[PDB]
């Protein structure tokens, strides 16, 4: 797992993103049948959401900050594939992706 200071930085980035209206579609895992999109898991083989990223950070399940960035990008790209590249949800994902990248560019180095 990444050292404490990087873990803290990523956690603060995630909390900042969670505060945003544009995060609302991404706060929790998708339940396809509950949303009457039963083909979701046929299209999306690696579901991802903000709660999972935060829990993984708390579980020290990331080895590098780039893995966090990869999971965030995967979440947004899942929306791009399933809802469409210009769908409302996808553009909200692009917005919070920009916010998260702003917070992650400032990630402190190991040494
Ligand atoms: C199928 N899927 N892929 C990624 C995410 C999803 C999905 O459906 N998650 C459940 C949702 C919760 C809130 C959503 C939403 N809130 C809004 C708006 C609020 C205010 C202005 S827009 N738009 O969507 S979606």
Short mmCIF file of C-alpha atoms and ligand atoms in Angstrom, two decimals:
data_model
loop_
_atom_site.label_atom_id
_atom_site.label_comp_id
_atom_site.label_asym_id
_atom_site.label_seq_id
_atom_site.Cartn_x
_atom_site.Cartn_y
_atom_site.Cartn_z
CA UNK A 1 0.00 0.00 0.00
CA UNK A 2 1.00 3.61 -0.66
CA UNK A 3 2.50 5.52 2.29
CA UNK A 4 0.31 7.45 4.70
CA UNK A 5 0.82 10.91 3.19
CA UNK A 6 -0.10 9.82 -0.35
CA UNK A 7 -3.06 7.84 1.02
CA UNK A 8 -4.23 11.00 2.80
CA UNK A 9 -3.82 13.12 -0.32
CA UNK A 10 -5.90 10.72 -2.42
CA UNK A 11 -8.54 10.45 0.32
CA UNK A 12 -8.87 14.24 0.45
CA UNK A 13 -9.18 14.31 -3.35
CA UNK A 14 -11.96 11.70 -3.20
CA UNK A 15 -13.82 13.54 -0.44
CA UNK A 16 -13.59 16.77 -2.43
CA UNK A 17 -15.02 14.97 -5.46
CA UNK A 18 -17.80 13.39 -3.40
CA UNK A 19 -18.95 16.86 -2.37
CA UNK A 20 -19.72 17.75 -6.02
CA UNK A 21 -23.14 17.50 -7.64
CA UNK A 22 -21.46 15.97 -10.70
CA UNK A 23 -20.34 13.05 -8.53
CA UNK A 24 -23.89 11.92 -7.77
CA UNK A 25 -24.07 9.16 -10.44
CA UNK A 26 -20.73 7.73 -9.29
CA UNK A 27 -21.08 7.66 -5.49
CA UNK A 28 -22.18 4.02 -5.20
CA UNK A 29 -22.00 0.78 -7.21
CA UNK A 30 -24.46 0.32 -10.06
CA UNK A 31 -27.21 -2.24 -9.48
CA UNK A 32 -28.26 -3.06 -13.06
CA UNK A 33 -31.63 -4.66 -12.31
CA UNK A 34 -32.54 -1.97 -9.79
CA UNK A 35 -31.95 0.63 -12.53
CA UNK A 36 -33.66 -1.55 -15.19
CA UNK A 37 -30.46 -1.76 -17.24
CA UNK A 38 -30.07 -5.56 -16.99
CA UNK A 39 -27.41 -5.68 -19.74
CA UNK A 40 -24.99 -3.50 -17.75
CA UNK A 41 -22.63 -6.28 -16.62
CA UNK A 42 -22.59 -7.66 -20.17
CA UNK A 43 -21.03 -4.36 -21.32
CA UNK A 44 -19.11 -3.36 -18.18
CA UNK A 45 -16.76 -6.11 -16.99
CA UNK A 46 -14.93 -3.91 -14.43
CA UNK A 47 -17.50 -1.79 -12.58
CA UNK A 48 -16.07 1.01 -10.46
CA UNK A 49 -17.45 3.77 -8.22
CA UNK A 50 -16.24 6.41 -5.77
CA UNK A 51 -17.21 4.42 -2.67
CA UNK A 52 -15.10 1.49 -3.87
CA UNK A 53 -12.11 3.77 -4.49
CA UNK A 54 -12.41 5.30 -1.01
CA UNK A 55 -12.75 1.88 0.63
CA UNK A 56 -9.75 0.58 -1.34
CA UNK A 57 -7.72 3.57 -0.15
CA UNK A 58 -8.75 2.82 3.44
CA UNK A 59 -7.89 -0.87 2.95
CA UNK A 60 -4.44 0.07 1.57
CA UNK A 61 -5.30 -1.84 -1.62
CA UNK A 62 -3.41 0.56 -3.92
CA UNK A 63 0.31 0.12 -4.57
CA UNK A 64 0.86 3.38 -6.49
CA UNK A 65 -1.09 6.62 -7.01
CA UNK A 66 -1.31 5.74 -10.70
CA UNK A 67 -3.52 2.78 -9.75
CA UNK A 68 -5.98 5.19 -8.11
CA UNK A 69 -5.97 7.35 -11.24
CA UNK A 70 -6.55 4.19 -13.30
CA UNK A 71 -9.62 3.24 -11.25
CA UNK A 72 -11.07 6.75 -11.54
CA UNK A 73 -10.52 6.75 -15.31
CA UNK A 74 -12.07 3.28 -15.50
CA UNK A 75 -15.21 4.54 -13.74
CA UNK A 76 -15.61 7.41 -16.19
CA UNK A 77 -14.79 5.26 -19.23
CA UNK A 78 -17.39 2.70 -18.09
CA UNK A 79 -19.92 5.49 -18.30
CA UNK A 80 -18.56 6.56 -21.69
CA UNK A 81 -19.03 3.03 -23.04
CA UNK A 82 -22.41 2.20 -21.53
CA UNK A 83 -24.24 5.55 -21.37
CA UNK A 84 -22.35 7.06 -24.32
CA UNK A 85 -19.43 9.45 -24.76
CA UNK A 86 -21.62 12.58 -24.70
CA UNK A 87 -24.31 11.37 -22.27
CA UNK A 88 -25.19 13.57 -19.30
CA UNK A 89 -23.76 11.07 -16.81
CA UNK A 90 -20.57 10.75 -18.84
CA UNK A 91 -20.04 14.51 -18.99
CA UNK A 92 -20.60 14.71 -15.22
CA UNK A 93 -17.93 12.03 -15.00
CA UNK A 94 -15.61 14.16 -17.14
CA UNK A 95 -16.21 17.09 -14.77
CA UNK A 96 -15.32 15.15 -11.63
CA UNK A 97 -12.42 13.57 -13.53
CA UNK A 98 -11.01 17.07 -14.07
CA UNK A 99 -11.54 17.92 -10.40
CA UNK A 100 -9.83 14.70 -9.29
CA UNK A 101 -6.89 15.30 -11.64
CA UNK A 102 -6.49 18.80 -10.22
CA UNK A 103 -6.21 17.27 -6.76
CA UNK A 104 -3.93 14.40 -7.87
CA UNK A 105 -1.42 16.51 -9.82
CA UNK A 106 -0.44 17.83 -6.37
CA UNK A 107 0.26 14.33 -5.03
CA UNK A 108 3.35 14.46 -2.78
CA UNK A 109 6.26 12.23 -3.76
CA UNK A 110 7.51 9.33 -1.66
CA UNK A 111 10.84 11.04 -0.93
C1 LIG B 1 -25.72 3.45 -15.26
N1 LIG B 1 -24.72 4.29 -14.62
N2 LIG B 1 -23.42 4.39 -15.02
C2 LIG B 1 -22.79 5.23 -14.22
C3 LIG B 1 -23.69 5.68 -13.29
C4 LIG B 1 -24.90 5.06 -13.56
C5 LIG B 1 -26.17 5.30 -12.77
O1 LIG B 1 -27.21 5.39 -13.33
N3 LIG B 1 -26.06 5.47 -11.33
C6 LIG B 1 -27.24 5.75 -10.52
C7 LIG B 1 -27.44 7.28 -10.54
C8 LIG B 1 -27.59 8.16 -9.48
C9 LIG B 1 -27.75 9.50 -9.81
C10 LIG B 1 -27.71 9.78 -11.17
C11 LIG B 1 -27.83 11.01 -11.82
N4 LIG B 1 -28.04 12.21 -11.28
C12 LIG B 1 -28.09 13.11 -12.25
C13 LIG B 1 -28.30 14.47 -12.10
C14 LIG B 1 -28.59 15.16 -10.94
C15 LIG B 1 -28.76 16.53 -11.09
C16 LIG B 1 -28.61 17.01 -12.38
S1 LIG B 1 -28.26 15.64 -13.37
N5 LIG B 1 -27.92 12.50 -13.41
O2 LIG B 1 -27.76 11.18 -13.15
S2 LIG B 1 -27.48 8.27 -11.95
#
